[PDB]
Design a protein around this nucleic acid. Sequence first.
RNA 1: UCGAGAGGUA
Lengths: 40, 62, 61, 41, 97, 62, 42, 287, 424, 103, 357
Amino acid sequence: TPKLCGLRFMKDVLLGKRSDHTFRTVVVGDPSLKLNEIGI
Amino acid sequence: QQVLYTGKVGDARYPHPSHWGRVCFLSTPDGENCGLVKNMSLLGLVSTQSLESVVEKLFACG
Amino acid sequence: TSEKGKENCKKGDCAFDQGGYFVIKGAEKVFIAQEQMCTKRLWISNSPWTVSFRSENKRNR
Amino acid sequence: NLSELGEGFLQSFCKKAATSFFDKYGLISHQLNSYNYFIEH
Amino acid sequence: MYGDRGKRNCWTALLETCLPIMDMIDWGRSHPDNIRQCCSVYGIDAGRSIFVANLESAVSDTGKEILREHLLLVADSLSVTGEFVALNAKGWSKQRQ
Amino acid sequence: MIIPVRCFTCGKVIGNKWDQYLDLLQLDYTEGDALDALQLVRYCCRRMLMTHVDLIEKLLNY
Amino acid sequence: TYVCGDCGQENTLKSGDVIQCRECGYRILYKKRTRRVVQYEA
Amino acid sequence: TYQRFPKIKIRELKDDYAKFELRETDVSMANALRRVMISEVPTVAIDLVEIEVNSSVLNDEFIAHRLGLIPLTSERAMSMRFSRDCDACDGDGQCEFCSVEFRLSSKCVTDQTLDVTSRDLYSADPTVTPVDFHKGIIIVKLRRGQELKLRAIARKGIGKDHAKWSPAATVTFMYEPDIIINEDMMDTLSDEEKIDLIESSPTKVFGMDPVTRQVVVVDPEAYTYDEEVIKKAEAMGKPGLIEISPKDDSFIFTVESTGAVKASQLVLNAIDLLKQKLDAVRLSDDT
Amino acid sequence: IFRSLMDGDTVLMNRPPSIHQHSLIAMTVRILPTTSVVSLNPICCLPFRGDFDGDCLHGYVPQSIQAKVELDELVALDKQLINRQNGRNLLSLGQDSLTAAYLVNVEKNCYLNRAQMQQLQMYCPFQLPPPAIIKASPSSTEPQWTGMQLFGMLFPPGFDYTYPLNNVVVSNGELLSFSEGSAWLRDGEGNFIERLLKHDKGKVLDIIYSAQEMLSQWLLMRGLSVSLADLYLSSDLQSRKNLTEEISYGLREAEQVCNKQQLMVESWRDFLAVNGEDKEEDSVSDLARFCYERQKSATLSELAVSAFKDAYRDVQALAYRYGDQSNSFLIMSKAGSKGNIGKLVQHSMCIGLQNSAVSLSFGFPRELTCAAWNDPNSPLRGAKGKTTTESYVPYGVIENSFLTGLNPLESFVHSVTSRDSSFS
Amino acid sequence: ERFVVPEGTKKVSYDRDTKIINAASFTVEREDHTIGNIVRMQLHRDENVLFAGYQLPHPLKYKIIVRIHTTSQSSPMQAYNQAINDLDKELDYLKNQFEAEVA
Amino acid sequence: LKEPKIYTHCELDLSFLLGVSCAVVPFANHDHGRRVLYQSQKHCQQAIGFSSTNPNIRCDTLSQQLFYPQKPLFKTLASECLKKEVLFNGQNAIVAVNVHLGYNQEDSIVMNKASLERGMFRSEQIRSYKAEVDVQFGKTHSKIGKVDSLEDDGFPFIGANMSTGDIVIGRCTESGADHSIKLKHTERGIVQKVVLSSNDEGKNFAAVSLRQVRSPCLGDKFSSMHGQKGVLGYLEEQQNFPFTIQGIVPDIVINPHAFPSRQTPGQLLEAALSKGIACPIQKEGSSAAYTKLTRHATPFSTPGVTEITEQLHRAGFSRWGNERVYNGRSGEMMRSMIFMGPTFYQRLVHMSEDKVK
RNA sequence: UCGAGAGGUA
Ligand SMILES: [Mg+2]
Ligand SMILES: [Zn+2]
Ligand SMILES: [Zn+2]
Ligand SMILES: [Zn+2]
């Protein structure tokens, strides 16, 4: 059972994809920053 | 507690009055196995098979 | 580990685990209690109405 | 008498009995007893 | 009513029973509660209106506020072919066919 | 784990008071009286001297 | 230099096949720490 | 429009404990003085630790961390220069201005457990000897064998970073409240109510005079600003029986040092550092 | 040809799963000295539907210039000000901001002097209003500013607002009047944020940011805390005893109301009619049978639950009578930032009704005491023998509260009731 | 790292306010609440000063912004320097008093 | 004792009904069921406390130990009977329920920078790498790079700082091929010990342990004993905290808005009880009053609120657990008293740098 | 590395 077959194959090959230039980190609160600004 | 399927189990996920003092009813894992896995209480003992036979002693009582 | 003294056990286990696991391939394995229906009590079910006598050792249900 | 023992004595005895129970069986004894029974018989 | 057999329509059977009391029941507003056969009984528009009312009731029960245009668009999209198809792939395939 | 020094909350030196605290506990002194004899008026230092567990003994033995 | 287990003895063995302690029989060895200066930021 | 004229009265003064009253000043001045003496006064502490033998059960970083927290005499802290400012040396071993070298070597050759305290810590400069209080601060406990030899360097630092260069230990200040009693509504109160009112105070701020059969104010500086007596008076039906308000221009300071510097010297250094900060902040006129 | 990320760049931020289109927000990069974490304004939590408790937001850096250009023109926060679901404003004040606004607009008895007012004016964009309080005492100098004028520096001079329900009138950017309710502050049909957005829509974000900063500073000056006095919900011990007795009597009255409501069935039409019936005493003598009948029947259970809620509204209403104005729980409930009246009632007075939707094999024996747990005829012991029973709809009332503690039977009942939430 | 003033950046910068006459903003780099609060409190003692306040908008960016509004009798920079001089004199007096009290 | 001859049996203690991970929780019956379940299931397992007293014999992966474990001020009957201090894993710090410039919104946590730098909530992480050889261990590929720390036997010397792209275990063939194991992007630390062992079959096993001291960073997640869970929103200097009359600054600051939603009473009760226990009972009395202090926090045997208030009042503080505080930035006295108490907190295994991708 | 089974995060 590869688990990548049928509908899941479609989802993982054409519907859902992974892209470059992406970052994932935990988020905290900073009232000093403006509403449209994100702290990096 | 083994169940064929996880989504549909029945009333086995809820605490029972038989759990009083044997298995904790306030602490159960959260998720798919919610209530299927039960933690034993502090004063919890599991009985073991007795080598001696109580049949002979029962007749003495009456 | 059991029997005799624990002076040599000090040069050994950390005396923080009572010991209930198995060393299979260097990884500790612990059994989980499995709840099973009692086989020494008459079992009555519905749809259909039936009463069954469980089998102790051989399939004499 | 029924009340001659006293309330505090019963509380102390309950604590001592709990300590003795934890000293005799321990936190894990069911698994040890089950494994010992399997080996012996 | 009882769905023992689908041989006869429940609404038509109810109409035959209420013959002695036809005047008492206001047939100008009475309608089946189901959405699927309401189109067959009173037309696609009546079923669409009842579906919109039920959707508004469900949204109100959910506690959220949704604009009318969204629900109206959903209702008009689920009944393009004149029949309320299901949300499964079979309904989508039938609508495309 | 030896007795922590510098009383994280307050900042007062408490590193050299563990032996005196143990000596006071050896006699007929309660925890409060022993802490008072060490001149600890803030309850943070008293908590630090009271909540410490001596673990280095087991490390040396084992 | 390698330290043995329950027995105190320096094996000082670098051969690939030499993994067993001499005159001890056990095959557990701990690497010994030499005299090297290492700096830490307090 | 011009400067203030604060007045200072010292109640108790010791090597590490000082308690004085500051009057005729704003709250901001006292708060700034407290902040400067708790986070701006520099001291000397070990920051770099080099070890060669670490056979002890404790980890190297744990030993270094507990070595850095040892209080050291900081009489030369004001005169010493910062390591980053010191340009004569890049920083290695003993320096005439910034770095002070410490040597520690402990070997246990007896059955009894050997305790590595702070007393067996030797430095080239006698003025930077660690403060002695007793048996000293225990660093590591050693069994038979288990040698411990290390080389440490202590540098001047500010208490703002790493919170280990702070000589102050919870320096406080209060407003020194004044207690006002109507003395007329007390006559209406019964003897039983007076005792209950006295017991309502969390601390010993009010006393009962047996000769005059009336309450008196004793030790007004221990009120702690807990509105217990006022709430009790309001509950009893007397709203304006006791009126307590803080005094804005009066303060009582409590300074406790860690032994690095004297409390009076700590206050003087804090004042000097605040003056230097003001001088640096001062802006020249522009045409 | 690659350069490092810097200030001014736009990154598309998302919180998985994306339930609505507003989860995708284009935000300008702001470099911070902190490491291994990303900082977000707490107000922006509502579009992401997440809190700062371990949530991870994964962003996407657009490489092509066209994607960046379309990112800040359609997915920017200023572009998504209007919620596309209901047509209201997407961004609200937030917990602390809402609570601080409620406190500064409700108290009206605390005055700010010149120094504090000027310190708070730094964050506010608009100028300082007149003190409006020249002398408050014959010997009181230093004319002060009222709290409501502080909140008035958040509105443009041309802005005009009117909320009849809360008696809120804003003329020339000045808050003239306000009574209670705090409904205008919270999100709604006539919230002031929506009116500000419909007024200018250019500086609404700056107004919200300045309001948050100023309210945070004001609340820091004041200080908000929860103590044991708030949970006690009584001035003294006598008030606590009176409240306990009142709660007990209210629960008894609610139980009697439920028992009366259970009779609205076709089996008691002969008794409910206006005639002469000698079985009046038998209807009130069987008190324990009503619980058993309620647990077995689902319609009776629903009717009893409805009646119990209707009667328990009055019991919940006692918190305002026995609660102080300075209570933090009451302030947060009235402001709408967090919690409600029922949660406070469970905190202090009583947990109340505890019922489970699913059918179970046991039933709560109407008392939740040690003696009830030992009764062989209780519904908890399988069946009451009144012929046996197979399923039950549990129904129990907990007289104790969280502050007073729960006996093990009440804790078991609460766990049985709340076990359904933890399911997947 | 944070203690050192950034290279090429002056500690205090003067920026006049065009909207309001006799108004200016002083940006003090690498400063905390200690200096700002005492400067603000000293400025209130001056009769010519109308608006006196400070803010620390970004804790990460160690900067202090001081805004001074004065009447048509003295410049904001003059009031700032006068407040600094008065605070220095107060510190000198307090040091002398403490030295006398110790002895 | 109230009514005899009607009860056949009696229970030794009602707290023994709960599990080992649930009976140790103080004021368990005073908390909501969901939070008790969370604390007894997940937070107890994720706590960082005592690792082991013999770390040398164990080469287990991802072993974590706290520098200064502390037992709670309160006592539990189950913990007292078990006579083991390993039940509680964490440290108790002064916690104040107050808003701090909006940096603790959305159940966030603000901690004291000074308190952490003194050695609070500091833990060490030891990670082990295992390689099996039946090619032999050895240092090869001269002048290739990243092999400076490797010795002649193929293993790094103890005390070497290992970074990414460096070989931790060196395996080479007699023909010059290198089947060596390197450190990945997120792998770093200082080598602690090297263990060489072989089985009866003759296969050789090598274990290298890397250790690194972890300090509480921003994204680190912390949990309480009553289900209160959050991340460290901001680190504030000691001088800016709202110091009390005696200068005791809070180590942890939590937002008041979490209590009405989570419905977790007892944490305030725990704080009040711990404060009453820790505070010195002077009373100007020669009699030993320290032997009459309520210390046990058994769930079903919890003391009443009145007893806790009386004990706290006898300590010289307000009976409601709140004390007057002064703003650290301006020095002014706050209008409302702030509740402060030494609650017991736990540091979870989840870290910010572990989630960075 | 390609997979499977577990345990956890929101
Ligand atoms: Mg969350
Ligand atoms: Zn302390
Ligand atoms: Zn050997
Ligand atoms: Zn130098």
